[PDB]
Design brief:
The structure is a homodimer.
Chain A: H1 8-19, H2 22-25, E1 29-33, H3 39-46, E2 51-56, H4 58-70, E3 77-81, E4 97-102, H5 115-125, E5 126-133, E6 136-144, H6 147-153, H7 166-174, E7 177-179, E8 191-197, E9 209-216, E10 221-234, E11 242-245, E12 257-268, E13 273-282, E14 290-298, E15 304-310
Helix pairs in contact in A: 1-3
PDB class: transferase
Keywords: niaid, structural genomics, SAM, SAH, Seattle Structural Genomics Center for Infectious Disease, ssgcid, transferase
Assembly: dimeric
């Protein structure tokens, strides 16, 4: 199924980062984590890499091997099946690589990401000073008006054909929504609240992420939710930076946005200052789940708290 | 995740079939296969069943137990975890039930359905003459014009940033698409091609389904695909029949429609007669996959053949 995903904004960014930098890729040894059908391997080979190693799961690697052969790069691109953890060593006696390509960003950047895997491949195989394509992501958050969706899809559970489905409402509030929002719904300024630099970040830094955000209301309005997204930069390597956004002001990507519904709507007035804290950690019961807690104030008022689990 | 699906057309049909037939449900013993959060159990209890047994998987049964308790029916509704196959016997010494409620229909009716499970629960537990809510489904097929989607999403694979992704095109053609189509795309009459009556069908009948269809072109047009859907009837039990459709002329359901792209577009003229054969069987390599082969003629011309695998 993933073998047929089309994300033009995504792929166009990788294409420019690689093919606009042939000078950089010429005779490098490139490793592609989670290569899928192999398009980024093909970009790397066309950019002049001398060796591309792509890793992914058995069935999709079989298809990519055929695509690489139809495109005349079997001599350059080698594709191996399995997880990075289970690979004792790279093929052909190769011990180091010059460039790691990956698509590590998950939903909300960190939900079901390949971040831990890319960091491990980096530590094992990247040469000092080698390049991660891409290497920086920045997360943004802001407040939106979203009462139609909240009434139709969250309050809906109070009266389901006359029955009380309140127990489901608590879960709807707890689960961040991966969905598109229209930029015209934004009612506050936009706050940067997280940066991940793959050049320097360490696995230990990702056990507990504690950060802050601050934005200002622009309207008299009730706020039903905060929406978050990330921008992505190919910062070291390209000769002019290449970046793309997953936010609501530009073309959609398969990451969409992430929507955090508030338990109680926030009465906002123009120039109200919302200051908050976000903690992110892997869920202890199910390590594939993500615990996200928020705490915030409006003009220094009482602390509103809310806890989320991405599952 | 399934705990939050809203399908109004679906649920409204079950609601009318049950609550418009309190006379029938009064003091019956009802079994609900795949009950989810429990709304149909609640309908059955409100309709006057004396005992409702709901079956589903562990985590969703925990939520439904709370919803049943908040709605005052714990004395009527008992919810058990697990698969029907792994349940040695029904609770409380109950050996027979009067009514089986289920949502057995899968995509394209038969892909990942609960059909085998409901038939097994029927044979084990339904009293002779007992009721299956619902018990009949009829499948329809017709031809559509769909060149914009075919060019954008199937021909797309011939030139992916200059690269040849043909190997992916073969797979796109082989995989039926579960998606909505607009009724205005239909360019032929509609053909009934399958009926499943849970009152009489036997498991052996579902190892190889061989059936036929016939429809007539209404336009001079190229046909890119056949679309199929099913209608569903609560036939024995209700005092006036209750039915709903998953077709493109009425409100959408979560089943959408199923689209079968032709390898080569079919040149159609008004009143051309398309006669065909559909065989359906479980895939031998992966029993969760569905093999669907079609063979058809236009005015008795050469046989066009096409094979599909729903995965």
């Amino acid at each position: 199924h993933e073998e047929m995903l089309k994300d033009g904004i995504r792929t166009n960014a990788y294409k420019n980062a690689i093919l606009q930098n042939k000078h950089l890729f010429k005779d490098k040894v490139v490793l592609d984590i989670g290569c899928g059908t192999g398009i980024l391997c093909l970009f790397a080979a066309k950019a002049g890499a001398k060796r591309v190693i792509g890793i992914d799961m058995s069935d999709i690697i079989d298809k990519a091997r055929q695509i690489v052969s139809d495109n005349g790069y079997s001599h350059v691109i080698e594709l191996i099946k399995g997880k990075v953890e289970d690979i004792a060593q790279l093929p052909f006696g190769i011990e180091k690589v010059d460039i790691i390509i990956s698509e590590w960003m998950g939903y909300f950047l960190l939900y079901e990401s390949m971040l831990q895997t890319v960091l491990s491949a980096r530590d094992r195989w990247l040469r000092p000073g080698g390049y991660l394509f891409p290497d920086k992501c920045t997360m943004y958050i802001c407040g939106i008006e979203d009462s139609e969706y909240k009434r139709d899809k969250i309050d809906f559970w109070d009266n389901v054909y006359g029955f009380n489905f309140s127990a489901i409402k608590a879960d709807a509030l707890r689960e961040p929504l991966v969905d598109f929002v229209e930029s015209q719904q934004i009612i506050t300024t936009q706050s940067k609240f997280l940066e991940i630099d793959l050049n320097t970040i360490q696995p230990e830094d990702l056990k507990q992420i504690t950060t802050s955000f601050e934005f200002t209301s622009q309207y008299q309005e009730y706020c039903q939710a905060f929406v978050a997204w990330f921008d992505c930069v190919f910062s070291r390597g390209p000769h002019k930076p290449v970046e793309f956004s997953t936010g609501p002001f530009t073309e959609g990507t398969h990451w969409k946005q992430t929507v955090f519904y508030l338990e109680n709507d926030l009465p906002l007035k123009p120039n109200d200052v919302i200051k908050g804290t976000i903690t992110i950690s892997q869920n202890k019961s199910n390590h594939r789940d993500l615990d996200i807690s928020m705490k915030y104030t409006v003009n220094g008022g009482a602390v509103i708290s809310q806890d989320y689990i991405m599952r």
